[PDB]
UniProtKB/Swiss-Prot annotation, chain A:
Biological source species: Saccharomyces cerevisiae (strain ATCC 204508 / S288c) (Baker's yeast)
Family annotation (PROSITE patterns): RIBOSOMAL_L5
Taxonomic superkingdom: Eukaryota
Gene3D superfamilies in the cross-refs: 3.30.1440.10
Function: Component of the ribosome, a large ribonucleoprotein complex responsible for the synthesis of proteins in the cell. The small ribosomal subunit (SSU) binds messenger RNAs (mRNAs) and translates the encoded message by selecting cognate aminoacyl-transfer RNA (tRNA) molecules. The large subunit (LSU) contains the ribosomal catalytic site termed the peptidyl transferase center (PTC), which catalyzes the formation of peptide bonds, thereby polymerizing the amino acids delivered by tRNAs into a polypeptide chain.
Gene Ontology cellular component list: cytosol; cytosolic large ribosomal subunit; nucleus
Protein name: Large ribosomal subunit protein uL5B
Subunit structure comment from the entry: Component of the large ribosomal subunit (LSU). Mature yeast ribosomes consist of a small (40S) and a large (60S) subunit. The 40S small subunit contains 1 molecule of ribosomal RNA (18S rRNA) and 33 different proteins (encoded by 57 genes). The large 60S subunit contains 3 rRNA molecules (25S, 5.8S and 5S rRNA) and 46 different proteins (encoded by 81 genes). Component of a hexameric 5S RNP precursor complex, composed of 5S RNA, RRS1, RPF2, RPL5, RPL11A/RPL11B and SYO1; this complex acts as a precursor for ribosome assembly.
Single annotated GO MF: rRNA binding
UniProtKB/Swiss-Prot annotation, chain B:
Example GO biological process: cytoplasmic translation
Domain of life of the native organism: Eukaryota
Physiological role: Component of the ribosome, a large ribonucleoprotein complex responsible for the synthesis of proteins in the cell. The small ribosomal subunit (SSU) binds messenger RNAs (mRNAs) and translates the encoded message by selecting cognate aminoacyl-transfer RNA (tRNA) molecules. The large subunit (LSU) contains the ribosomal catalytic site termed the peptidyl transferase center (PTC), which catalyzes the formation of peptide bonds, thereby polymerizing the amino acids delivered by tRNAs into a polypeptide chain.
Name under which the protein is recorded: Large ribosomal subunit protein eL21A
Gene from which this protein is expressed: RPL21A
Swiss-Prot record, chain C:
CC per GO annotation: cytoplasm; cytosol; cytosolic large ribosomal subunit
GO biological process terms, semicolon-separated: cytoplasmic translation
Annotated protein name in UniProt: Large ribosomal subunit protein eL29
Record's keyword annotation contains Cytoplasm: yes
Superkingdom of the organism of origin: Eukaryota
Gene: RPL29
Phylogenetic classification of the source organism: Eukaryota, Fungi, Dikarya, Ascomycota, Saccharomycotina
Membership in a protein family: Belongs to the eukaryotic ribosomal protein eL29 family.
Compartments reported by the entry: Cytoplasm
GO molecular function: structural constituent of ribosome
Keywords on record: Cytoplasm, Isopeptide bond, Ribonucleoprotein, Ribosomal protein, Ubl conjugation
From Swiss-Prot, chain D:
Gene: RPL10
BP term (GO), one: translation
Protein's UniProt name: Large ribosomal subunit protein uL16
Subcellular location: Cytoplasm
Assembly: Component of the large ribosomal subunit (LSU). Mature yeast ribosomes consist of a small (40S) and a large (60S) subunit. The 40S small subunit contains 1 molecule of ribosomal RNA (18S rRNA) and 33 different proteins (encoded by 57 genes). The large 60S subunit contains 3 rRNA molecules (25S, 5.8S and 5S rRNA) and 46 different proteins (encoded by 81 genes).
RNA sequence: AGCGCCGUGGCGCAGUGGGAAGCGCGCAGGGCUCAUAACCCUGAUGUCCUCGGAUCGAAACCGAGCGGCGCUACCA
RNA sequence: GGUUGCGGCCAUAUCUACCAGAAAGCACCGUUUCCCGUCCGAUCAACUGUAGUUAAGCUGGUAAGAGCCUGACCGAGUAGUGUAGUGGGUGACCAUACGCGAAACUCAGGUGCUGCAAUCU
RNA sequence: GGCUCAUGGAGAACAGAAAUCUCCAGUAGAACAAAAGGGUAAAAGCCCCCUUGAUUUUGAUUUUCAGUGUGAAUACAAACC
RNA sequence: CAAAAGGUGUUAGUUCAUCUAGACAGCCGGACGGUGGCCAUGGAAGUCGGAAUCCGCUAAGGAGUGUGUAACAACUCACCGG
RNA sequence: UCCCUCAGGAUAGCAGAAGCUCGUAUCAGUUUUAUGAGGUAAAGCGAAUGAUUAGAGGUUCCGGGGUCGAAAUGACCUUGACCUAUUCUCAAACUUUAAAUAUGUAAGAAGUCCUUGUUACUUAAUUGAACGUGGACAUUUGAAUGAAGAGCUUUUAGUGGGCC
């Protein structure tokens, strides 16, 4: 029937993207370190654009991923800012979802005038238990059509838990 | 100018094979080569060390030396009006055994068995092989085989 | 002004007096054979020589 | 251009407009299908062929000139939608020309046969013996406007060609009565250009999505 | 209406890799460089100490390769340590060492090289390989096949390596990937290695997690409490296991409870067997007949 | 095709230690004159030809590619 | 017969969709003191075999399935080609004599087999 | 030693065709200094750790070939790494 | 040396159609009434065309094959017939 | 093959002569049987790369616009990007497949089988590997046909424009 198709948040990836490396990104790193409690990873630019105002190898963005009851708590914090109202967009065909928060002083963080203000990109990677099979080194394999967490199951779960609406 | 490089004119021969790309199957390495054993020469383009010249691709010689990852083969190279004794140094993926010599070396034992048997029995052995003999006198029977009278066809388009 | 190359008459020339096999001796060329196999093989054959020199009585 | 007898026979290997040619004068023939190229298969039962009974190269020029000539004659007699003519020979072979030039020029070109490798002159359709040139599909009522159209087209190409009223239906590979025997049951369907026949293989429900007059 | 990524052209041109690369069970890049031999040795069949960590078992085989398939010289499993009295922790560092000792001792018993190459009889937990004796035959050269397991320092796969070397086999190695190889200064300290040998790390977790979360000490170690086994005893349990393995590794199978015919009879019952040509003839005739008459 | 000089605002150009773009002409708008010109003031207009690299610093420095100009060669 | 570990040949084994799996085994799964590696015990590491599980993996079956592998007097003795002629034809090219002989297409079948060691109601 | 590349698909504030993030497909359609061809998918590719076999000794072998040279290459052996 | 393309020169051949009056010949009786058939227009009436298409006694004759007219009319072709 | 070589030379070949070692050998511009190699002719494109004609279907999410209630993330289109299943014709520098003719090797005394000897090589080993000792099997001596004698060496001429 449905014994172990528990459908638990795999990870929550909090992404901030600046077109500037130095003062403001050393601040944005301290912001994600403050929120999550993990020294984050400063993403490097893939190729120069010359229109947005970046070059390649220029250390443009910074992100972190959290796993488990922490990720659940930060998703609660971020959802209450989004009113527990997330469009039927924002929810990928592979049953993942995300949203963007402006002015990081929400979520019960202090302003921290020493650093300033920032926007974030929350992405919740949803998944059913026993998905190790795809990621483990030895004896790899793809999950069956049953175990594939689809859009409809992630939407209906996001309703049941968090007590939210899909707005569309 | 003209091109006479080592691997020149060898697009299609050192080509791997259709859906036989990737790795060499391990029997190739577990196979045992000894001196006096007749072996083919056929390069595996996927392996680019101890590979034979395109000349020797297709040739058959006899192993003369045996070392770590490689053998040594003697091949007959006609140049002008006379053969020479060409000694190759081939990694073991570029060679294989010749069923040519395997079918002889089992016929030797088949002859040894036939003769050693028929020495102490009623003897009509004829150990030598004979070619395809002119077929003997048979009666062909037309019992439910009354010959079908075929005729040649008229011409027609398509 | 000249011509460049032809392999015409070259077979005829070769076959007239030639195409010949290298005669194949018994006890072949033991040169370019594994040096440590040789180094040993000497001592083996010297051992067999002593063993038949002992057998001669 | 040079005369056609300069480049009549298949002397050189197929020299196609490749990534090695790179700079070819575009074919003089661009329209291969004329008449009612959108007609139902069941509309045009009679097919006639203009087949080369010789082996040679035909100029792109000759193809367009003969196409113009045949379609014109058939459109004028019968009407512009009483048939579908189809050219089945594409100019891909590239003819070269040495073009013996008067002066050396600034670049110091050359005299006679020093560097005689030619430059793309025009294209040719390398036809073979028993290879078809013009296929037409009309009513069984015509045939005569069609053969006479193809006869007027023969005067354009070199060598020898023949007119064959084929035993096939349209441009299908089936015969006249046995195509009708497939059209009896739901074994046939129509695209609009051509026909797809029911295969005795594949996913059964996927076959039954179409051909519901079969399995009836 | 975008990709149709799994085309007929794709499937026709698709070369499937070696069945054990599709199963994801064998590194052929390793297996080649591992099994292939110096051809001047002709037929000296290369033996490999193949070690495999499943859940609740440590498989450790001494395998040599033929053209027709790998064969086994001797084979040991951690599920047959309870004969020697390792009842709990079958898939830990201490079990690995014990199975490594057992497989080594089984081979040398079979091959008649048990009297010489007894191994280490006074375990300090030192890195050392079995030296070849003068005026005698040489020790068994076997090479550790690891598989798709990473070469980390303090892996159980090297617990088995240490076990086998102590068990009298010549399995050549360095001390780099042993638990207690201090990274800063190029030195092994035998304290943490000897701890890990005698389940020191499990026993030193026992007293810490007994004083701390007793709910977690009831979650884990529920078998250890049921056996009346305490944190102190484990060193002497493994010492009794070492000596009993060394005394009698006589390769004892089971009693085979409903024999190979009785198992086949029982197993064949539920397994679905292939349909015939007349079966499919009727099947397709029925699935055509479903759609034939307006359902 | 080769040889030499070039590529920056609409035009013609300077530019340098590598950190960071100006000069003249014009263009628009003022002032002066009764009015126009001359004249005196303000401004605005930039993929520093392109893709890579040396570099913390490039439009300059190296490489390759593209385009521009002039000359030489070339008489059916 | 089932399963595992290591395999041989490397699609009859792969792909796509579904539907089953008693036992054992495999797995998913549990924990983070230690060894160890991460931005994240997710992957990798150690601990337990305990807290749950066949939903996934894995194995098997199903489908006028894709693909692949077979076979045929299937097409075809066709295309092509070795040899021969003071054969034909303006030529392009072609027919015959003595030999060798495909590829497509069509139809029928098939859907891994096997080596070693251990385990299994 | 870890990983998988092109491209496509669905998605996350500013962010759009293009900055970063996540998953799904992906037999190579990428990449490997250049010409072109061959080769390569737990790698030969991309990222990371340590080094200097780009070393010493001279011989045999292959291609070009007179079986000369030169160049390049192969396989050992003896040392040291 | 000769090509494409042609010949009711003559020979053989391939496919389809006609014949107890064929039918070909090869001469001569009619080619019509309804009907001035619809629209286009001074005009189109058998013949500017988009197109329809029936009948009457019918031996047969297009609701029209060519000359003719502004438009008719007329002579004449199939079509059958002494 | 090399040369300031291209009207020339050295070089190897073809040629003659002098012979020599032995006496039908295990040789052959040959076939058969067995076993390789090949990517050319043909074929193929509803198989990859590249070329290429024709419609049908979906387009739906997306580049061109309203026809329209100003107005529709819209009813009707031409539409470009495409995807799907069909279609016509092609490739010296495409290819799954793949000839014919040419081409490698084997078809036995230097062979086979059974014991056993040294060795500083290799082996966990008393296992191998190379070479042997000692035995055993010669009518069919291990396909066909031929064999003009078979093998060996020295020396040196001319030639190195060729043409059909």
């Amino acid at each position: 029937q449905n014994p172990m198709r528990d459908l638990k948040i795999e990870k929550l990836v909090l992404n901030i993207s600046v077109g500037e490396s130095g003062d403001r990104l050393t601040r944005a790193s301290k912001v994600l370190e403050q929120l999550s409690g993990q020294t984050p990873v400063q993403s490097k630019a893939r190729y120069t654009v010359r229109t947005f105002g970046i070059r390649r190898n220029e250390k443009i963005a910074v992100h972190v991923t959290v796993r488990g009851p922490k990720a659940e708590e930060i998703l609660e914090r971020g959802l209450k800012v989004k009113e527990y109202q997330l469009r039927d967009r924002n929810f990928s065909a592979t049953g993942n979802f995300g949203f963007g928060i402006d002015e990081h002083i929400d979520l019960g963080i202090k302003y921290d005038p020493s650093i300033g203000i920032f926007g974030m990109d929350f992405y919740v990677v949803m998944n059913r238990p026993g998905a190790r099979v795809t990621r483990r080194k030895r004896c790899k394999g793809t999950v069956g059509n049953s175990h594939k967490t689809t859009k409809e199951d992630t939407v209906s779960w996001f309703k049941q838990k968090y007590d939210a609406d899909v707005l569309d | 100018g003209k091109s006479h490089g080592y691997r020149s004119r060898t697009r299609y021969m050192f080509q791997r094979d259709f859906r036989k790309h990737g790795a060499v199957h391990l029997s190739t390495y577990l196979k045992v080569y000894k001196v006096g054993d007749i072996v083919d020469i056929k390069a595996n383009g996927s392996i680019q060390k101890g590979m034979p010249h395109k000349f020797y691709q297709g040739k058959t010689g006899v192993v003369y030396n045996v070392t770590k990852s490689s053998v040594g083969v003697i091949i007959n190279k006609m140049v002008g009006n006379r053969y020479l004794e060409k000694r190759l140094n081939l990694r073991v993926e570029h060679i294989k055994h010749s069923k040519c010599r395997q079918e002889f070396l089992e016929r030797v034992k088949a002859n040894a068995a036939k003769r050693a048997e028929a020495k102490a029995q009623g003897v009509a052995v004829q150990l030598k092989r004979q070619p395809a003999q002119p077929r003997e006198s048979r009666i062909v029977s037309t019992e439910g085989n009354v010959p079908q009278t075929l005729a040649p066809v008229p011409y027609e388009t398509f | 002004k000249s011509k460049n190359h032809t392999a015409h008459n070259q077979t005829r020339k070769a076959h007239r007096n030639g195409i010949k096999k290298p005669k194949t001796y018994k006890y072949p060329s033991l040169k370019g054979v594994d040096p440590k196999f040789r180094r040993n093989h000497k001592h083996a054959l010297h051992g067999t020589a002593k063993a038949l020199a002992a057998a001669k009585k | 251009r040079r005369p056609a007898r300069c480049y009549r026979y298949q002397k050189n290997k197929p020299y196609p407009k490749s990534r090695y040619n790179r700079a070819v004068p575009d074919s003089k023939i661009r329209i291969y299908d004329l008449g009612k190229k959108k007609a139902t298969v069941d509309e045009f039962p009679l097919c006639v062929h203009l087949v080369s009974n010789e082996l040679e190269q035909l100029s792109s020029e000759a193809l367009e000139a003969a196409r113009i000539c045949a379609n014109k004659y058939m459109t004028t007699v019968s009407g512009r939608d009483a048939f579908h003519l189809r050219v089945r020979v594409h100019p891909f072979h590239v003819l070269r020309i040495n073009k013996m030039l008067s002066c050396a020029g600034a670049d110091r070109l050359q005299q006679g046969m020093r560097g005689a490798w030619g430059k793309p002159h025009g294209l040719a359709a390398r036809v073979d013996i028993g290879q078809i040139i013009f296929s037409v599909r009309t009513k069984d009522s015509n045939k005569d406007v069609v053969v006479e159209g193809l006869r007027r087209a023969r005067y354009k190409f070199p060598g020898q060609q023949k007119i064959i009223l084929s035993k096939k239906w349209g441009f299908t590979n089936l015969d006249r009565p046995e195509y009708l025997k497939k059209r009896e049951a739901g074994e046939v369907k129509d695209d609009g250009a051509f026909v797809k026949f029911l295969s005795k293989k594949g996913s059964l429900e996927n076959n039954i999505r179409e051909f519901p007059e079969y399995f009836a | 209406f975008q990709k149709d990524a799994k085309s007929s052209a794709y499937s026709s041109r698709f070369q499937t890799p070696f069945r054990r690369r599709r199963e994801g069970k064998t590194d052929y890049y390793q297996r080649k460089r591992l099994v292939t031999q110096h051809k001047a040795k002709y037929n000296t069949p290369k033996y490999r100490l193949v070690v495999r960590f499943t859940n609740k078992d440590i498989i450790c085989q001494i395998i040599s390769s033929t053209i027709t398939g790998d064969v086994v010289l001797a084979a040991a499993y951690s599920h047959e340590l309870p004969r020697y009295g390792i009842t709990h922790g079958l898939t830990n560092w201490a079990a690995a060492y014990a199975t490594g000792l057992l497989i080594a001792r089984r081979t040398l018993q079979k091959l008649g090289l048990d009297e010489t190459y007894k191994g280490v009889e006074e375990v300090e937990g030192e890195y050392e390989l079995t030296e070849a004796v003068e005026d005698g035959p040489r020790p068994f050269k076997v090479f550790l096949d690891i598989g798709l397991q990473r070469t980390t320092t303090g892996a159980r796969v090297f617990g088995a390596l240490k076990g086998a070397s102590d068990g009298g086999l010549y399995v050549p190695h360095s001390e780099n990937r042993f638990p207690g190889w201090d990274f800063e200064t190029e030195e092994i300290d035998p304290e943490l290695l000897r701890s890990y040998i005698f389940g020191g790390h499990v026993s030193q977790y026992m007293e810490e997690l007994a004083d701390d979360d007793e709910e977690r000490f009831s979650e884990l170690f529920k078998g250890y409490l049921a056996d009346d086994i305490d944190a102190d005893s484990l060193e002497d349990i493994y010492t009794s296991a070492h000596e009993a393995i060394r005394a009698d590794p006589a390769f004892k199978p089971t009693e085979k409870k409903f024999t190979k015919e009785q198992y086949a009879a029982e197993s064949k019952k539920y397994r679905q067997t292939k349909l015939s040509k007349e079966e499919r003839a009727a099947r397709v005739a029925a699935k055509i007949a479903a759609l034939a008459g307006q359902q």
